[PDB]
């Protein structure tokens, strides 16, 4: 019981991490939509002026 | 006039992401699934015991 | 033992369930953020056509 205790609160720590840089790629994906929209809207730019 | 010709197309694509924003909020997706997953979670612990 | 495989198999189901609901929602928060940058870029499309 003790063992589990000890293993729960590490696979706890691993589910944090897991969590932590899922999110950021789940951001990294968002950035990156983010960069195709605003190449699209440097294009308009460059076309306008 | 090329401009206005823009201005016509962005005004439709405005409208439609208007119409899809409003259909997906009507969805309600997000309580649904919470609720879901609470019974997705007791059923889960019904099972392991 | 048949009771443990028709839970798995039960739970298994809701489990496709609740990650349909999962992407369904994450769709719409991309869609979230698509309706926010796609409505600014239409304010600076107004501000010069």
Redesign the interface.
Known sequence: SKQMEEESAKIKDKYEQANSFLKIMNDLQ?KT??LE?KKD?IVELRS?I | IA?NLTYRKNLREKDALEREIAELEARNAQEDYDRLIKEAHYLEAHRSK
Chains 1, 3 share one sequence.
Do not use: H, L, P, W
């Open positions: 968002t939509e983010k929209y809207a306008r | 401009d």
